[PDB]
Write a protein that binds this ligand. Structure first.
Ligand code: HEC
Ligand code: HEC
Ligand SMILES: O=C1O[C@H]([C@@H](O)CO)C(O)=C1O
Ligand SMILES: O=C1O[C@H]([C@@H](O)CO)C(O)=C1O
Lengths: 126, 126
């Protein structure tokens, strides 16, 4: 859907800004510093689920740029596995949010966060 | 969810970048220049539906900036009505996509586009 490669870079950077806000806005809730409203978090995690699928289609072939390391394209199977791990962790976070269980939420949230950091450590320019 | 007002501006600009890409990538389909796959468009419009709700919460009180006109906050009822119109047009686009009807899709897509332009004409700095 991108007229030029720069358009894919702009799209993915926007997508990761959104996904990051929908993840990180739950930090105070997971830490107990903000109240836990199960419905609020269920709805938010549904948004995060949709957003979490979007960046990956904007690393198509030819969209080299931004802070994406080139190893994203040359180790395509290894990058796909960091992305799949992250998405399966998002499924576990959805399950926790749907269950309305703060303990389960905290654990799943930590797993998600670890998966974000693991991909950045390998595939995001420093 | 924004530590500072600048964070709301960054979020909404990212949100409108995503929503714009998910809307505008359907232009070739509506024009017949790309094939119409009803399932493909149904899925895409589900993403657009989620995205289309996101910008509006990032014009909270105090988030003046970017290319948002100040009349967004001082004519809050009038801005809310441009946003509601746009969201009700998104509902009609969802219905068309769910029905798998290209004629209905084209008509709904045009209504959505008009609603985007009408809000920009009033509320987006030139
Ligand atoms: C690979 C499988 C990743 C996962 C999982 C996550 N992120 Fe990511 N992120 C990745 C790349 C390759 C890039 C660079 C994109 C580009 O083209 O520039 C990013 C970027 C971000 C950014 C922007 C940082 C900046 O300097 O602007 C943020 C804020 C970010 N990523 C956050 C984030 C979060 C919160 C994730 C889990 C919830 C997450 N990322 C996962 C690769 C990958
Ligand atoms: C008000 C009810 C709006 C509707 C409906 C739509 N848009 Fe919008 N848009 C609006 C504002 C107030 C702004 C500025 C945001 C800021 O703080 O800067 C925008 C911005 C955009 C942009 C970015 C333009 C730029 O110069 O970067 C785009 C690409 C954009 N809007 C597209 C868009 C589309 C495709 C819409 C319908 C599908 C749409 N907008 C609706 C206000 C409103
Ligand atoms: O909200 C965020 O969480 C991850 C990471 O900090 C988790 O360790 C990340 O990159 C963000 O922007
Ligand atoms: O894709 C887009 O459609 C609207 C408008 O051009 C429709 O008239 C807009 O602002 C876009 O970025």
């Amino acid at each position: 859907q991108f007229a030029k490669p720069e358009d894919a870079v702009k799209y993915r950077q926007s997508a990761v800004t959104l996904m990051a806000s929908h993840f990180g806005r739950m930090t105070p809730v997971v830490k107990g510093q903000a109240p836990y409203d199960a419905a609020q978090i269920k709805a938010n995690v549904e948004v995060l689920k949709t957003l979490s699928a979007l960046p990956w289609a904007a690393f198509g072939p030819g969209t080299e740029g931004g802070d994406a390391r080139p190893e994203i394209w040359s180790d395509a199977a290894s990058f796909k596995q960091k992305q799949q791990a992250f998405q399966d962790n998002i499924v576990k976070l959805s399950a926790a949010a749907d269950a309305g269980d703060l303990d389960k939420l905290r654990a799943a949230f930590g797993d998600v966060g670890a998966s974000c950091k693991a991909c950045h450590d390998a595939y995001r320019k420093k």
